C-alpha cells in the first residue's frame, strides 16, 4: 500500500516489465530456457574461481563446469518438485501445474546450455 | 479451534468480555446468579487462546476455561 | 520570557514517609500482602512517570535524583582521591614509574588474604591497580600526598553541597515546569559553561599548573625538589626560565601575536618520547580551542534578547519533499517527554565513551599510560562495556517512550509516524543485512576452521592462500600518515602512532607501535560490525513495534513492561518491548566481549611488548596473522594460550583474580536457572515448601510468591551479564598482569 | 593412625609444607627493609603460620600423603581416637545455634500474628520485641521439645493449606 | 524520632544491624585467634 | 564376500547425495499432497 | 439490532497515507475485516496496523486482515470518543458476515436474547479424570 | 576428594528425583493448576494469570529434569 518511488519508478516498471518472468508474451518453455541461461551463466562463475582444483589450470574450469551443471540440475529438481507440489489443486500458464513443468524443463535445458556456453568462453 | 467453556460459578461480572480481545465471549441471562448475568462462548472458532479471560475473572481458582488445540488461521492470529 | 520559576516549600522534610515503603504508588501503598509486592517496591522507586501524571512533580524528582548521583559520584571521587593520599604508594611511584606498580588499595590481615598486598615496588603493599589514577595524577600536577588528600576532602565538601542542594532543590525551593521546558536556555548554558568554561578552567591549569611539573618531572629532577604550583602561579620568574614567552606577560594574547606562545602551546602531534604520552602543551592548545569553539556555540539560540536561534523554528524549516512534515512534532515532543531525551542522552553518551576507549587506546594522553598495558587494558575494556550498555539503555527508554509518550494526534505525518509507517520494510532489510553479514564473516570462519581440520591451508582465508586484505583501512591508514605531510602541515608528526611511523618506548615496555590490518583483523572487523547489526535489529525492532504489531494489535494498552499474551497466536511469550531489550542485552555483550577479545590480542601480538637491540618482542609473538583466522585458533592461541596465568595464580597475589573468576564462573551459571524454565514449577515448588512451613506453624504472613516472568528474566540476564563482565574482568587483569 | 593416615607431627609431607612456606614467606620478607611497614606485616603473617602449623600438630590431626590434614566424621571412631573435636562438637554446636535461629524465627512469627495487618510487623521488625525473643532463646531445645510434648510444635492436618490430588 | 525509629526498623535497616553485627563477631574471634580448625578447648 | 574396493567411491555418494536427495524429494511429495 | 446493517464500499476511508502492515495476500486469498463508523467530526486516531490517521466527518471505511485489529479499534474508538463502531467480515467469494454487534447492544449488555452455549452446567474441579474418558475422542470439559 | 565429588553426586542425583518427583506427584493437579489432568501432559502454560503460569506441566518439569541429569553424569 505504502507506495514508494523506487518500487513505482517508471524505469523499474518497465525493465520489471519486459523480464522473463513478469513478460507474459510466452510459453513457459522460452521462459525457463532465458532463466537457465542466465542463471547457469552466472552460476558457473563462482565455481570457475574458488574450487578445490582452482590451483591446476585446465581442470579447474571442467570441474567447475560439472559442479554447476549439477547444481543446475539439483535446482531442476526442486524445481520439478515444488510445481508437483504446489499446483495440484484448482489466466497465467505460469501459475498452472503442467505450465510449471513445462518452465522447469526449459529451466534445465538452458541451465545445460549455459554451462555449456560458459565452458566454450572459459575455453577461449 | 480452541474450546472456551464456562461454568457456574461466574458471577456476571462482565470482565472476562472486556478483556477479550476478539470477541468471543458474550452476556447472557441467568438465575444462578445475583447479577443475573452468565459468560457464553458464541464465537469460540475466533478465539485464539490467549488466556486474557482468565485474567480478568474475579472468582477463586477458573469460571472460564480456555484449551488449546487444532489450531487455524484464525486461532493462531495470522495476517497471511 | 526566560525566567526562574520556583515554588516555595512544595514537600515537607519528614520521617513520615520513610517509616511505609511503599508510598510513591496507590498500588503499592495498601500494604504488603505477598512478596512480589517487595520485589514491586525495588522496581518502581525510579519509576516516576508511574507514581504521578504531573510532569513538573517528575521533573523535581529528576533533578533531585540527579543531584543525588552526582553526590554519589563526587563521594566515590573523594574517597579514590583519600585512598590515593594515604593508602598508596604515589610517592613512590613518581620516582620511578616505569618499576613501581601502582597500588592504591591495601586489605587487612585477618584470614590469609593479607597474600593479596603483593610487593609493588617501592617499599609498599597493596593492590596492582589498573584505574589508572596514578598516571591522572601526574598529569594534573600532583606530587605529595597533601595534594591528594586536599582534593579528597573538597570532593568531600562539594558532594554534601550537591546532596544539600538536592535536598533545597526538591524540598525548599522546587523549579517549575516552565523552568525545565527552557530548552534554548539550557543548551546555551550547557555549552558555554558547563563544556567550555570547564575546558577554559582545564586548559588554564594546564597552562600554569601542569605543564611546568610535567617538564620537571620529564626532566628527571626530584619531585620533592619540584617548586609547588603556586610558586609558578605567583612568582614569574620559575615560569619564565621553563617558558620565554610567559617574559612578556600576556602581551601575545591581547596583541594577537599567539605564535609567541608556540613554546608552550605546541601542535607536535605524536607521543612524547620521554613518558609514552600525549604532549601537555598539545592538550593545553587543544582544551582552549575547545573552551574557544564551545563559548562562541554556547550563543546560539535565543533566550531572552532577540537574537539567537529557535528550535522549534529550525525544526520546522528543514522539512523534505520526500519526508512530508520534516521534523515537525519533535521540539513537542523532547519538551514534554523525559523518555526520549534519556534515549537520546544514552545513545549519544555511550557512543562517546566507545569513543573514548579508541581513542584513548590510541593516544594515550598520560604520562606513563601506555607502558602499563594493564591500565591501558582495563580502561578500554571498561569504557567499552559502559558505552555498550548506555546504547542498549538508550534503546530501553525508547521504547518506554514509545510505549507512554508518544501521542498520535502531534504525529501525524511527520518523521516519527513515517518511521512507524515503514518499520516492516526497516526490519526486514536490516534482517536481511543481519543475515547476510553473519553468513559473510561466520560461515568464513567455520569454513577456515574446517579446511584447516581438512588439511587445506591454501583453502584458508587466510594471510597466506586468500588475500582478503582491508584496502579501504591499510589506505586510510597510508593517508593519515601522510596528514602532516601535505594536508596539516604545521603538524611535527603524524597524530598518532597507529597509521604508522616508528616504534615509542619507555623503560625498555613499547609504548606505541604502527598496527598492521590483514585479513584478520578484516574477519573480526567485520564480525563487529555483524554483532552490532544484529542487535540494532533487535533493539529497533523493540522499539518500533513496542505499539502494536500484526501479531498483537494492542500491545500499547498491555504496557511497556509486560511478560506475555498468554500461548495465544501460537504463544506471544517474550513479546514486550521489556523482552526485546532483555534479549539484546546479551547480544550486546556478546559484541563487546568479542570487540575486546580482539582487542587483547591484536595489542598483545602486533603493538605490546619488550624492547631489545633485535627488534621488538611481542608478548604473544604475533600469532594474530595466522592464529585469528579460526575459532580453534581463539580457543587455543587466545583463550588456552592465555588464562594460565589466572589458574596458576593461586598462592600469590593475584589469586584474588582466580577466586573473581570462578565466582563470575559460577554467577553465568546460576544465571542460566532464571533465564530457562518459568513460573509455574517455582510456584508449585514454593506451594510445597508454603505446606512445609504450615506444618511447623512458622509459614509467614507476608506470602512467598515465586518471581514475575518479567522479574525472572531480568535476574537471568542481570546475572548472566554479571558473571561474564567478571569473567573476563578476572581473566583479562590477571593475564595482563602476570604477564605484563 | 586411622585410614592408612599419619598424624601431622610425625609426618614428613606437613614439615616440608611448613618448610615450603616459610622459605617463600622469607623469600617475599627479604625484599624489604627491616625498618619498614611491609617487614612487620610479613613477619607477622609468618608468625601467624607457625603458630597455626604449631596448633594444627599436637592437636589430633592427622594428614595423608600430602602434609594437609584429615577429618574423621564418624562419632565412637572419632571419641576413641580424640576426633571428637573436629567435626562432632562443632557439629552440635551448629545445630545448637540453628535452632536459636529456629525457634527465634518461629516465636516472631507466632507472637507477631494476633494483631492487625501481620505483614506489616513482618515488615517493620519491633526492634525491642525481636531483641526480647533475641534474648529469650537460650533454652530453645527445651521449649522446642515442651511445643512437641503439648503439639503447639506440629499443625494438625485439617487446618493447613492443601495442594489438589 | 519516631518516625526515624520504625525506618530504622524496616527490615533493610535491621538486617544491616544484624550483618554488620555477625561480620564484626567473626572478623574480630578470627583476629584473636589467628586460623583455628579444630576445636581443642 | 568382500566387497570390491571401489565400493566406498559409489555407497558413500549414493547414501550421502542420492539417497537423502530422494528422500527429502518423497518427504516434499508427501508433506504438500493434497486430497 | 433491529436491523442488520449492510456494508458500503464506497464509504469514504479516513485521510490516510501508506500502511506497511496493511492487507497481505491473505485478503484476495482468503475472509478480511472491514470496520465501518460514524464519525461526528474529523480527528486523528492511531491505527493498530501503524501510524496515524484522520477520520472523516461522516461514515469511515477501514479494512484488515485480523480480528484482533478490528476489535482494538473498536476499543481504542469506544474508549476514547464512544463511537461504537462494526466490523464485517468479507471472504473471497464476497460473503459478508455481521461480527461485533450480534445483537446490535454489545456483548457487555445482555439483551435478553442470546442463548448462551458452551457453557458446562458443572462446577470447575467436578470434571472427571481422563481415565474416564479413554478412546472416545471426548474431553473431560466437553461433556 | 573423592569425598567430596561423591557428594556432589549424591546432591546432582537427589535434586534431579526432587524435580521428577515434583513433576510426577504434581502432573494432574496443584494449587496454581488444579485442572492440570484436562490440558494433557506438554502444555505451554495457562497465560500470564495468576501471576504467571510457564513451565507448569510436568513436561516442563522433565525438561528441566534433563538439564540436571547431564550435569549429575
Ligand atoms: C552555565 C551554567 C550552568 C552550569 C555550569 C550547569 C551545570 C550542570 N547542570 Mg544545569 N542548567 C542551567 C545552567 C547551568 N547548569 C540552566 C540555566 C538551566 C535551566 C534552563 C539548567 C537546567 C539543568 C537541568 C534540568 C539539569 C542540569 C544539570 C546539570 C549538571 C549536569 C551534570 C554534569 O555535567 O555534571 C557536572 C558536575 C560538576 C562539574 C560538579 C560540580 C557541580 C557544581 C556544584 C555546579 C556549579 C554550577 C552551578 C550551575 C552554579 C549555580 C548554582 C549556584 C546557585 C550555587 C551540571 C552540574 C542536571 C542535574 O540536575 O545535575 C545535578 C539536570 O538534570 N541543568
Ligand atoms: C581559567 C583559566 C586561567 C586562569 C585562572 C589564569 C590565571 C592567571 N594566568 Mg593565565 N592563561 C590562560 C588561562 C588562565 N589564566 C590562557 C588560556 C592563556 C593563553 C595561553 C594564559 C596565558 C598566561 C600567561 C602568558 C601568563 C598568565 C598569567 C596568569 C596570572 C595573571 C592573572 C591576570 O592578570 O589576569 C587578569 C586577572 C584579573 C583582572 C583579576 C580578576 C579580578 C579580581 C579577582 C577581582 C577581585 C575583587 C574582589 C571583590 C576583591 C577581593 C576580595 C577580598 C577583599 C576578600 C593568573 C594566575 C601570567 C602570570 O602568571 O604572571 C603573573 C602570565 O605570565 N597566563
Ligand atoms: C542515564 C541513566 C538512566 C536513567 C536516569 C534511567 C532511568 C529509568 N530507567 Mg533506565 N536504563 C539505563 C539507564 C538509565 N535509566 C541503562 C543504561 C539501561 C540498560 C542496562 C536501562 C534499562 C532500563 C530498563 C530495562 C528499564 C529501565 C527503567 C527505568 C526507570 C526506573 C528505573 C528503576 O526503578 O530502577 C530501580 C533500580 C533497580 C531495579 C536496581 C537495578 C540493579 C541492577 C539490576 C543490578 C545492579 C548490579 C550492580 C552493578 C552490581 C551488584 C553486585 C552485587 C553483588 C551487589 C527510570 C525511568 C524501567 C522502567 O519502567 O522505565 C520507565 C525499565 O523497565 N531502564
Ligand atoms: C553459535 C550459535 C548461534 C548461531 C549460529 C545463531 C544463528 C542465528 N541467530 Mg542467534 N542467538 C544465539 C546463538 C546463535 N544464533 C544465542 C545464544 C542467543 C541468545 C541471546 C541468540 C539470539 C538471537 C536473536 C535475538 C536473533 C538471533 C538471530 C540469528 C540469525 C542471524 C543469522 C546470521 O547472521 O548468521 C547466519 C547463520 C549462521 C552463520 C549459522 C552458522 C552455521 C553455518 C556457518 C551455516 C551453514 C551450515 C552448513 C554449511 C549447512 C548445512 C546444511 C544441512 C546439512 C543442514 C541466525 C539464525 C537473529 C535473526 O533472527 O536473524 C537476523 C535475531 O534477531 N539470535
Ligand atoms: C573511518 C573514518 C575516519 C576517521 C575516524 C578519520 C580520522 C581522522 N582523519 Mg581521516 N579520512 C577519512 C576517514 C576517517 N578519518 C576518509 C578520508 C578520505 C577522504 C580521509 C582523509 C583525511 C585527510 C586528508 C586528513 C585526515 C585527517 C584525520 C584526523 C583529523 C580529521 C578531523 O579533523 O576530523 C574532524 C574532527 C572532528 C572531531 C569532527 C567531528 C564532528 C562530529 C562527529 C559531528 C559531525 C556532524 C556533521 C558535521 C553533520 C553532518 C552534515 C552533513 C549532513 C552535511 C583524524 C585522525 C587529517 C590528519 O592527517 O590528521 C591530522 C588529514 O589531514 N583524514
Ligand atoms: C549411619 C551412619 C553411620 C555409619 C556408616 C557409621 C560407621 C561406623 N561407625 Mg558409627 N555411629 C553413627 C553413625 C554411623 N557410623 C552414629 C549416629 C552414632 C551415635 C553417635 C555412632 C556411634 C558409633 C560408635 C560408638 C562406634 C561406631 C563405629 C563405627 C564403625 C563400625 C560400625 C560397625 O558396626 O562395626 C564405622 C566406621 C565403631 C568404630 O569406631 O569402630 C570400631 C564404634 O565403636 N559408631
Ligand atoms: C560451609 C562450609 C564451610 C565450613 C564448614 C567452614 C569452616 C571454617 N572455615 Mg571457611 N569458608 C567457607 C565455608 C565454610 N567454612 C566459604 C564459603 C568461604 C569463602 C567466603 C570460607 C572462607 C574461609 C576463610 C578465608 C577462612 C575460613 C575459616 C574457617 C573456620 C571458621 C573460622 C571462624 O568463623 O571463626 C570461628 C567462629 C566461631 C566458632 C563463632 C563462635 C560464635 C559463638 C561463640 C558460638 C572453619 C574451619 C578460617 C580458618 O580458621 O581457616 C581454617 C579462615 O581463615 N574459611
Ligand atoms: C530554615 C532553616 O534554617 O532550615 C535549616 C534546616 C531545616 O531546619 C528544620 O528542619 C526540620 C526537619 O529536619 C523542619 O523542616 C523544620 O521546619 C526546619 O526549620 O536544617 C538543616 O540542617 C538543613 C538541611 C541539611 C541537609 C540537606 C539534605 C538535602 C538532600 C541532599 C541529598
Ligand atoms: C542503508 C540505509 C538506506 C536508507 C534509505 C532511506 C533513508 C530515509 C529516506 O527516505 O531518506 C530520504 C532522503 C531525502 O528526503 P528529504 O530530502 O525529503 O528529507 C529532508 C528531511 O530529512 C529534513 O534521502 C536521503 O537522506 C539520501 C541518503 C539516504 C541514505
Ligand atoms: C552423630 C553424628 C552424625 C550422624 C547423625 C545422624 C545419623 C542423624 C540422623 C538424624 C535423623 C534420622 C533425623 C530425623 C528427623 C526426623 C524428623 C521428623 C525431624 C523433625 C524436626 C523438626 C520438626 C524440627 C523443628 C525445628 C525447627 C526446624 C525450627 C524451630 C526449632 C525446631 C527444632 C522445633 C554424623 C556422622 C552425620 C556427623 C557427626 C555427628
Ligand atoms: C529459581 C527461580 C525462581 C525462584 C526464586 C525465588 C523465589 C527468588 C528467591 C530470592 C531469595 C529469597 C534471595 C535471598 C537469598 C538469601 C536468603 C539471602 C542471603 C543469605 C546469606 C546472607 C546468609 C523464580 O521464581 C523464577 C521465576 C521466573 C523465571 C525463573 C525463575 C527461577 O529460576
Ligand atoms: S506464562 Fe510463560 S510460557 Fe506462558 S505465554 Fe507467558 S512467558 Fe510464555
Redesign the pocket.
Known sequence: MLETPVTSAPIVANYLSNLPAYRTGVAPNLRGVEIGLAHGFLLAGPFIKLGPLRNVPGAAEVVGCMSAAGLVLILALCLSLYGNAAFQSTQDPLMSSEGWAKFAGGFTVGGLSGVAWAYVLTQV | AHVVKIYDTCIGCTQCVRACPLDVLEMVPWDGCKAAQMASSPRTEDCVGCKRCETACPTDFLSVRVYLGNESTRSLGLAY | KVKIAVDRNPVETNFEKWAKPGHFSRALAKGPNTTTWIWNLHADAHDFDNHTSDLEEISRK??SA??GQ?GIILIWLSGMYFHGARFSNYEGWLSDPTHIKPSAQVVWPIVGQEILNGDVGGGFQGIQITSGFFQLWRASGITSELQLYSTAIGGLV?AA??FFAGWFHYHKAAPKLE??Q?VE??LN??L???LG??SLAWAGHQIHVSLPVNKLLDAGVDPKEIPLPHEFLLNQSIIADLYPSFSKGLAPFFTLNWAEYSDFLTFKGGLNPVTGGLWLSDTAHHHLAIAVLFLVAGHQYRTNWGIGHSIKDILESHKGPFTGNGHAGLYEILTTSWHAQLAINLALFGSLSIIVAHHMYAMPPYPYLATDYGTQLSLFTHHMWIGGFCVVGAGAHAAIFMVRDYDPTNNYNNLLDRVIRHRDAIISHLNWVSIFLGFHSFGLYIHNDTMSALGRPQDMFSDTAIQLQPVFAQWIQNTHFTAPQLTAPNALAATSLTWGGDVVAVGGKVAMMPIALGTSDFLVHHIHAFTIHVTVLILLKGVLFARSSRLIPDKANLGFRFPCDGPGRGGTCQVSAWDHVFLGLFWMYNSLSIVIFHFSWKMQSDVWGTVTDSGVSHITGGNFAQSANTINGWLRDFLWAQSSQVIQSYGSALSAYGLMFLGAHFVWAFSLMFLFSGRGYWQELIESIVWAHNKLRVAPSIQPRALSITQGRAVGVAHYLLGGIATTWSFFLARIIAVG | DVAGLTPCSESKAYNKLERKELKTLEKRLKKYEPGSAPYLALQATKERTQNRFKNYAKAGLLCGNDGLPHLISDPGLALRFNHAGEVFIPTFGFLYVAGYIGHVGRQYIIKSKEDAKPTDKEIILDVPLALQLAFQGWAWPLAAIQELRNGSLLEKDENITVSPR | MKDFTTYLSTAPVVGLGWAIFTSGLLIEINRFFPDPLVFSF | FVPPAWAPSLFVPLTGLVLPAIGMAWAFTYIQKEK | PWKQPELDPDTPSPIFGGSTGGLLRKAQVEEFYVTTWESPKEQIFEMPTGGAAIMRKGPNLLKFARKEQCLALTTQLRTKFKMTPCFYRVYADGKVEYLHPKDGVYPEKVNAGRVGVNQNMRSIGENVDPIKVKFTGSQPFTI | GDFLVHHAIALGLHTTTLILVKGALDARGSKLMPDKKDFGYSFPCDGPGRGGTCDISAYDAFYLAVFWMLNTI
Open positions: 529528576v533533578f540527579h543531584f552526582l562539594l553541597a550537591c523552568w525545565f527552557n536556555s539550557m548554558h550547557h558555554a559553561g558547563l568554561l570547564g
